[PDB]
A paper describes a structure:
We prepared crystals of Ntaya and Zika virus MTases and soaked them overnight with 10 mM AT-9010. The structures were determined by molecular replacement, and the electron density for both expected ligands, AT-9010 and SAH, was clearly visible. The AT-9010 molecule was in both cases located in the GTP binding site, as expected. In fact, in the case of the Zika virus MTase, we did not observe any density corresponding to the γ-phosphate of AT-9010, and we therefore did not model it. In the Ntaya virus MTase, the amino group of the guanine ring forms hydrogen bonds with the main chains of Leu16 and Leu19, while in the Zika virus MTase, there is an additional interaction with the main chain of residue Asn17. The 3´-hydroxyl group of the modified ribose ring interacts with main chains of Ser151 and Pro152 and the side chain of Lys13 in the Ntaya virus MTase. However, Lys13 adopts a slightly different conformation in the Zika virus MTase, positioning its amino group 4.5 Å away from the 3´-hydroxyl group of the sugar, thereby not allowing the formation of a hydrogen bond. In addition, the Zika virus MTase has a serine residue at position 152, which does not form a hydrogen bond with the sugar ring, whereas the Pro152 in the Ntaya virus protein does. The α-phosphate in the structure of the Zika virus MTase forms a hydrogen bond with residues Lys28 and Ser227, while, in the case of the Ntaya virus MTase, there is arginine residue at position 28, which does not interact with the phosphate group.
The NS5 protein of members of the genus Orthoflavivirus is composed of two domains: an N-terminal methyltransferase (MTase) domain and a C-terminal RNA-dependent RNA polymerase (RdRp) domain. The orthoflaviviral MTase domain binds to GTP and acts as a guanylyltransferase, and it also binds to S-adenosyl methionine (SAM) and catalyzes the transfer of a methyl group to the N7 position of the pre-cap structure and to the 2′-O position of the penultimate nucleotide of the capped 5′ end. These catalytic activities are important for viral replication, and the MTase domain is therefore a potential target for antiviral drugs. AT-9010 (2'-methyl-2'-fluoro guanosine triphosphate) is a GTP analog whose prodrug, AT-752 is under consideration in human medicine as a potential antiviral drug against certain flaviviruses.
Numbering used by the authors: 12 to 270
Write the structure that this text describes.
Amino acid sequence: ETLGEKWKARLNQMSALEFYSYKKSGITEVCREEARRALKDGVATGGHAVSRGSAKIRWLEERGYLQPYGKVVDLGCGRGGWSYYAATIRKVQEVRGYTKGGPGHEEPMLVQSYGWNIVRLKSGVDVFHMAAEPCDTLLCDIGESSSSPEVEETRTLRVLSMVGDWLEKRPGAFCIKVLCPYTSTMMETMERLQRRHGGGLVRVPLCRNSTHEMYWVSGAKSNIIKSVSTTSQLLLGRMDGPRRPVKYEEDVNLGSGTR
Ligand SMILES: Nc1ncnc2c1ncn2[C@@H]1O[C@H](CSCC[C@H](N)C(=O)O)[C@@H](O)[C@H]1O
Ligand SMILES: [Mg+2]
């Protein structure tokens, strides 16, 4: 039994009050109250991010874990937070977004932050059925939390199998969400993937404590077992400590205008 699997077992045993207290304890979060009201009014020129994903992907890029450029493919774009942030980067030529958009899923949102005119967001697209294309930056944020590790592991592996066909085209940069990296099989799978495509797993502090999600980014180089184990220790430690306040930060503002 791994530490992450122990974390998942402990998480499922929490009561509602225990879980919600632990979910945001000590995590970093961007303030989106201003963004929510502006978006609901239909404001598209205020620079607001359509979701908290823009801050997530910026945290990785600002620290040099990937440098988006060329043609960017955003698989599972949802509202489009990754695509809108990717559209503001120097060497990005265009951003192609795809998302399933089902009953519980998200539909693309149309805003006019900087570089909006080089973005195409398409809804109703299941990426498991579309053919892999060559690209320069491969983005994927797919994987849905579940109570059982078996479902999370299965969902993660299906994503990685689909992503492997895109990575065979060898994009220069990638950022792939790994919902469940904490099983021995998943650690083994990532090791083979890292040997073949490089990169490494990174834990973003904006992530909630209720998910073990890590991001496979081309710029990272750390060991996979150490990366997952260190993250599992952090999540386990926050369980047995008193509730720590949320570290709030200003949300990302992406400006306005065409490129
Ligand atoms: N098979 C699939 N094909 C395409 N999109 C999928 C998918 N399974 C899940 N998704 C979508 O992937 C999205 C992951 S949420 C990520 C949102 C985005 N990173 C942002 O910054 O806003 C969800 O909205 C979900 O609808
Ligand atoms: Mg979750």
